[PDB]
Amino acid sequence: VHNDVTVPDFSAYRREDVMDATTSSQTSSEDRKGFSYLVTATACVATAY
Amino acid sequence: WAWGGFSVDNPTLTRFFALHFLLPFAIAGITIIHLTFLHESGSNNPLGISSDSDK
Amino acid sequence: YTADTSLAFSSVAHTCRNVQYGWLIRNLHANGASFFFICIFLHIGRGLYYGSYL
Amino acid sequence: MAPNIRKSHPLLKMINNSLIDLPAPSNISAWWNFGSLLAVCLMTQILTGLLLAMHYTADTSLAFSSVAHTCRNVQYGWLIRNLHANGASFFFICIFLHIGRGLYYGSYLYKETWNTGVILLLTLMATAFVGYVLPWGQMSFWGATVITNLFSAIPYIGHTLVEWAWGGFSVDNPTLTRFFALHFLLPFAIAGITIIHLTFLHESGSNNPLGISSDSDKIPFHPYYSFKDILGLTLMLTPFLTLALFSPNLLGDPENFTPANPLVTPPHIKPEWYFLFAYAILRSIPNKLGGVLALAASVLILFLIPFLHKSKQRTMTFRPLSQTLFWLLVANLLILTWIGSQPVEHPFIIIGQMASLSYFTILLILFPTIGTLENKMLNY
Amino acid sequence: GELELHPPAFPWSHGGPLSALDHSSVRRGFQVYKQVCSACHSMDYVAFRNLIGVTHTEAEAKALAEEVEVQDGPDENGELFMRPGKISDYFPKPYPNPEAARAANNGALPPDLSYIVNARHGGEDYVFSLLTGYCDPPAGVVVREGLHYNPYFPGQAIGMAPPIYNEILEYDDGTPATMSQIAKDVCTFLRWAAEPEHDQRKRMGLKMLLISALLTSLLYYMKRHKWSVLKSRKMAYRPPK
Amino acid sequence: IHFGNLARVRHIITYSLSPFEQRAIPNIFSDALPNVWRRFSSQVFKVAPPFLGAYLLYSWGTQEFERLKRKNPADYENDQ
Amino acid sequence: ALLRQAYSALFRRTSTFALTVVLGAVLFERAFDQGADAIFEHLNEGKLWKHIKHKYEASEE
Amino acid sequence: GRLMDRIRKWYYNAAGFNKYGLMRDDTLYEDDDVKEALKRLPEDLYNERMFRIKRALDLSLKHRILPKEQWVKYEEDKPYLEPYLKEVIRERLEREAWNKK
Numbered sequence A: 001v002h003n004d005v006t007v008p009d010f011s012a013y014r015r016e017d018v019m020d021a022t023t024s025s026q027t028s029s030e031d032r033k034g035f036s037y038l039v040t041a042t043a044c045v046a047t048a049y
Numbered sequence B: 001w002a003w004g005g006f007s008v009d010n011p012t013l014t015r016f017f018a019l020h021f022l023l024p025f026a027i028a029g030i031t032i033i034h035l036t037f038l039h040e041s042g043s044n045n046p047l048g049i050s051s052d053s054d055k
Numbered sequence C: 001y002t003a004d005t006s007l008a009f010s011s012v013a014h015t016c017r018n019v020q021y022g023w024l025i026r027n028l029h030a031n032g033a034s035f036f037f038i039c040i041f042l043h044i045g046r047g048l049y050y051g052s053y054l
Numbered sequence D: 001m002a003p004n005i006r007k008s009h010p011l012l013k014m015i016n017n018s019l020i021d022l023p024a025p026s027n028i029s030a031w032w033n034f035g036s037l038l039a040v041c042l043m044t045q046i047l048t049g050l051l052l053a054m055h056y057t058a059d060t061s062l063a064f065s066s067v068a069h070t071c072r073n074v075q076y077g078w079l080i081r082n083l084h085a086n087g088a089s090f091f092f093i094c095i096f097l098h099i100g101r102g103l104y105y106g107s108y109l110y111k112e113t114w115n116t117g118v119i120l121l122l123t124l125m126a127t128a129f130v131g132y133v134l135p136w137g138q139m140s141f142w143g144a145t146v147i148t149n150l151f152s153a154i155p156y157i158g159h160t161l162v163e164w165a166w167g168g169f170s171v172d173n174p175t176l177t178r179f180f181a182l183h184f185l186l187p188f189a190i191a192g193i194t195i196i197h198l199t200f201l202h203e204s205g206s207n208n209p210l211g212i213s214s215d216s217d218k219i220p221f222h223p224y225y226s227f228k229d230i231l232g233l234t235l236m237l238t239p240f241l242t243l244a245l246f247s248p249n250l251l252g253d254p255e256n257f258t259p260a261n262p263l264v265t266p267p268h269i270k271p272e273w274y275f276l277f278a279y280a281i282l283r284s285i286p287n288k289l290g291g292v293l294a295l296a297a298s299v300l301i302l303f304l305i306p307f308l309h310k311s312k313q314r315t316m317t318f319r320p321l322s323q324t325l326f327w328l329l330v331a332n333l334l335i336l337t338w339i340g341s342q343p344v345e346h347p348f349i350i351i352g353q354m355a356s357l358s359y360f361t362i363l364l365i366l367f368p369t370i371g372t373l374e375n376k377m378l379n380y
Numbered sequence E: 001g002e003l004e005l006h007p008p009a010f011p012w013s014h015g016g017p018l019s020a021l022d023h024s025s026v027r028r029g030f031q032v033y034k035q036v037c038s039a040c041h042s043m044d045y046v047a048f049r050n051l052i053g054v055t056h057t058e059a060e061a062k063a064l065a066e067e068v069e070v071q072d073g074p075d076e077n078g079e080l081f082m083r084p085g086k087i088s089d090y091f092p093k094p095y096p097n098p099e100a101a102r103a104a105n106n107g108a109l110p111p112d113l114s115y116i117v118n119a120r121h122g123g124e125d126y127v128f129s130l131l132t133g134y135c136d137p138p139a140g141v142v143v144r145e146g147l148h149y150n151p152y153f154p155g156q157a158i159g160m161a162p163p164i165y166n167e168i169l170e171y172d173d174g175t176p177a178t179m180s181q182i183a184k185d186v187c188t189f190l191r192w193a194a195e196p197e198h199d200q201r202k203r204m205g206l207k208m209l210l211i212s213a214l215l216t217s218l219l220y221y222m223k224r225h226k227w228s229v230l231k232s233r234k235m236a237y238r239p240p241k
Numbered sequence F: 001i002h003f004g005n006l007a008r009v010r011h012i013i014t015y016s017l018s019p020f021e022q023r024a025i026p027n028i029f030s031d032a033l034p035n036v037w038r039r040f041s042s043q044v045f046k047v048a049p050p051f052l053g054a055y056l057l058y059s060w061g062t063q064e065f066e067r068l069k070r071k072n073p074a075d076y077e078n079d080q
Numbered sequence G: 001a002l003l004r005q006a007y008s009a010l011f012r013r014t015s016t017f018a019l020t021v022v023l024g025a026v027l028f029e030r031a032f033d034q035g036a037d038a039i040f041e042h043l044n045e046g047k048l049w050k051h052i053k054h055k056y057e058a059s060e061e
Numbered sequence H: 001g002r003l004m005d006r007i008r009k010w011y012y013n014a015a016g017f018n019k020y021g022l023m024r025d026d027t028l029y030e031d032d033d034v035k036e037a038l039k040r041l042p043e044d045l046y047n048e049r050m051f052r053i054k055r056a057l058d059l060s061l062k063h064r065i066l067p068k069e070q071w072v073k074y075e076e077d078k079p080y081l082e083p084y085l086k087e088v089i090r091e092r093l094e095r096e097a098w099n100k101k
């Protein structure tokens, strides 16, 4: 039964900031996305050049 | 720019020959699109009224 | 054909004069261009008169 | 009509069902990146090609220098010329991996996709062959003279067919022109046929390394493969540019910096690298006629691959025997290529014939045989 | 096949993928060609203007071309005529036609040197070896009347008599014109004549790599970033068993 | 229409996290490399062989060719 | 925190992301070129015309 | 002797499809017969194979395999489809032969 179902442990893959299950993940969100997007925004600049 | 110089000369003749060889094939490509859109609706007809009753 | 100011004119001429049926092909191509337009003009006309443009 | 335009529009719908919402297996590897590269590769040749054509002159008295004048006077002419020239190799390099991948993973089982594929290869060959004559250099001319004359061995209609092709009695101006014509034309036919290739392809969808139905796990092409391919594009494009820019003529015969001259046969007339492998099989059979056929067969053999599949499995992922046999064959082609580059003398002549023999043996007999044996070892 | 000696690899100042031509050495080379080789060797694809901003000043160039008379025309009467060169002219041919050339060099035909370093395996390394390398034939070998022995030239019997010797000319820049210095400079010049884009081409290669390395890394991260969703994905089989 | 008519699947749960809650290239030493090596090992003895066996043939054929160009003194020992 | 800020002011709004890519490019060009040209020249001191030009640039005849 | 058995077990391990958790029959190429064959499999066996197959694909996309412990052992590889597939072929050959007469 579905009650007997749980999400596995993604500690092995989670980013540093969302590693602790008792810390709001929203506070480090802008950083996590700002980085990745920063990488992407850069790729565009390179390509554009 | 288009002339490749200061007047219609050899550099033009060549790039025109190129364009003239090329374009036709673009026409053929586009004709496929033309007929593709066409087939969405089917042909129109002289009386201008729905011809589904008699195709 | 040769695309060079110094040979274009004569390449075309040499074609009609020495190439087997060159003259014919040259004509068909040349006149074909008009037949093309004549046709496209009627195709358009037809469209305008029967509101195909819709 | 429908909610989002991507699906309703008669055109976006096309772009969508083949580049955005297209079902792709989740486990395809880098070997699948070659399709897109071949495609990009093509768009690139045509672009650089046109640019070069807008400065070329097809006339024995001007070809060589038109090309020279282009590299010397046209802004970035030198760069375009290079990109186009080296691009041709990048093309073949890619096509050879594309094919390989197909063979090793039994993609050929998609007969029509495969058969159009062989047609693309043949077309690309004709294209790159005629292309090479355009600069009218020693090798351009001489290679053209030896290669085209080959047909003269065909019985009764031989000579006729060649003198027809040449437009005269020998490779001369009337040839240079019709080749330039052909060279401009074929690429576009390639593009067209590529559409057919992908059209058949889409009927079944891609194959995958494990060779088992991937319906239980498909993913949208975009972003997964759009991204994966754009990555594979830069990964290859680097070596291409590195070569094209640092070692420009690393692959070209220096003999082609000498204007064609009908009164000086070069010492070793050989075609471009990507052809050697077959040039090699050509010289293996002493007998102008047999050697031609052997050549023809060397490539036309691809049309039989589908009928020589005996394994109960599609790929070779789980067939170690077939695997060494596969890498043997690859190595075999490498040697054939090498032999093609060397003169016709001992110990080359014999190695040649040996490699040529092993080539057909592997594809015609070993592969299907080892295939059957493999089935028995699985208790099938 | 047959015997041949392959030239060695000299460390040209422009062998480095990122290393350009030493324009000073090229400038000398132009002189060597102008004052020695140009006597029998044509260089059809280079024009005096080509030197400007490379080895000479627009002024020097204008001068160097006026030192020559070219054939223009026809005039009002349809006749040909002479005039002092302009920077738009290409280096003068030494002979009217090849037939005339062979005639003045014992039936031998000095090839145009515009693409020579790319027309011969070894380029400069070969051309350089050839020039300096003349010598007497080894035992058992006889060179026919009119040819000269050079072990570096295929067949070893070359129609070109050693063209350069110490102090055969004076570099106006004050460089010791030893035979090897000459060959070296001229070979350097031949490289340039064969492909003027040399430096620009390499400067581009640099940019290409830097961008390439940058762009690749970026797209690798992006590719990985999207795929992560799958790469770490976990599944399980839960029948109502 | 290819998404929806693919396969009859039952009872398989999957779990995945947004690309932003996880690392792009994770466990490079603990997992990545060890597998790179793993994969490299499983194949070497399948690929490498025929390629090495090619090299040899190349080397032999090359060296032998050059050898046959060299002169054999045993042709001139009695040419006084 | 730049990443946080960057995200907010530059990467969040698609319109600003684009503006960043452009102005970003304009500045990247200007600096990448100057830098590479710089590197190329140092690597080739005294070989380029730019370097020896002075000898004939108003110093002869 | 056990030569034939030595070979098979060797090849079985040599092939290596068991490192993915797949069974001999899971690797069969789905030609016309195998297709009919599968349709006849009882639901429980069908669903299981499906998971196995989907799991194998996920490993492939991940460039990993199952831990040695979980590999299918030669002697425990269940030939779940083989029986069906044989009848499917028996049937066909009957029809093929009959339509000829």
Ligand code: HEC
Pocket: E032, E033, E036, E037, E038, E039, E040, E041, E105, E108, E109, E110, E111, E116, E120, E127, E153, E157, E158, E159, E160, E161, E163, E164, E186
């Ligand atoms: C007297 C005329 C003359 C002069 C001066 C001369 N050459 Fe030559 N050169 C020739 C001849 C003759 C040949 C052709 C030899 C042959 O093909 O047998 C030749 C050939 C060459 C070749 C090589 C041909 C080959 O097939 O490899 C090069 C390179 C060359 N010369 C370089 C030079 C250079 C550089 C100079 C000036 C330093 C120079 N030559 C000066 C007459 C000359």
Ligand code: HEM
Pocket: B027, B031, B034, B035, B038, B042, B043, B044, B045, C040, C043, C044, C047, C050, C051, C052, C053
């Ligand atoms: C390369 C030139 C063109 C080709 C080869 C082409 C071809 C066709 C074809 C095959 C049809 C279907 C049969 C017919 O009704 O004639 C068609 C229909 C049509 N074409 Fe074109 N066409 C061309 C140019 C144009 C142009 C210039 C216009 C107008 C701006 C046009 C407007 C239409 C329209 C509106 C129809 C609908 C006919 C109807 O009313 O049922 N076509 N065209």
Ligand code: HEM
Pocket: D031, D032, D033, D034, D035, D036, D038, D039, D042, D095, D098, D099, D102, D105, D106, D107, D108, D110, D113, D114, D115, D116, D117, D118, D120, D121, D190, D194, D197, D198, D201, D205, D206, D207, D208, D302
């Ligand atoms: C103009 C050259 C060609 C182009 C541009 C082209 C392009 C493609 C593309 C885009 C794909 C899909 C992605 C991929 O799997 O790589 C594809 C797949 C395929 N191509 Fe080609 N192809 C070309 C030549 C060939 C040749 C010579 C053959 C073989 C004789 C061939 C055989 C196949 C097959 C079998 C597939 C199926 C791939 C699979 O196993 O899933 N292609 N090709």
Ligand code: HEM
Pocket: D042, D045, D046, D047, D048, D049, D050, D051, D052, D053, D054, D056, D067, D081, D084, D085, D088, D091, D124, D127, D128, D129, D131, D132, D133, D134, D135, D183, D184, D185, D186, D187, D188, D190
């Ligand atoms: C299918 C892609 C193409 C391939 C594989 C290809 C291949 C080649 C090759 C191998 C050469 C000789 C390059 C050299 O060493 O000088 C060449 C030259 C040339 N190609 Fe292409 N080409 C292709 C498409 C095109 C197209 C579409 C055009 C333009 C309509 C074009 C125009 C030319 C011209 C003008 C030359 C002569 C100038 C030169 O030699 O650089 N090419 N091509």
Ligand SMILES: CCCCCCCCO[C@@H]1O[C@H](CO)[C@@H](O)[C@H](O)[C@H]1O
Pocket: A049, E200, E203, E204, E207, E208, E211, E212, E215, G037
């Ligand atoms: C993978 C994408 C590679 C593109 C790299 C762009 C580099 C080409 O940049 C070129 O550099 C030359 C040297 O200064 C300049 O003279 C040219 O004007 C410039 O376009």
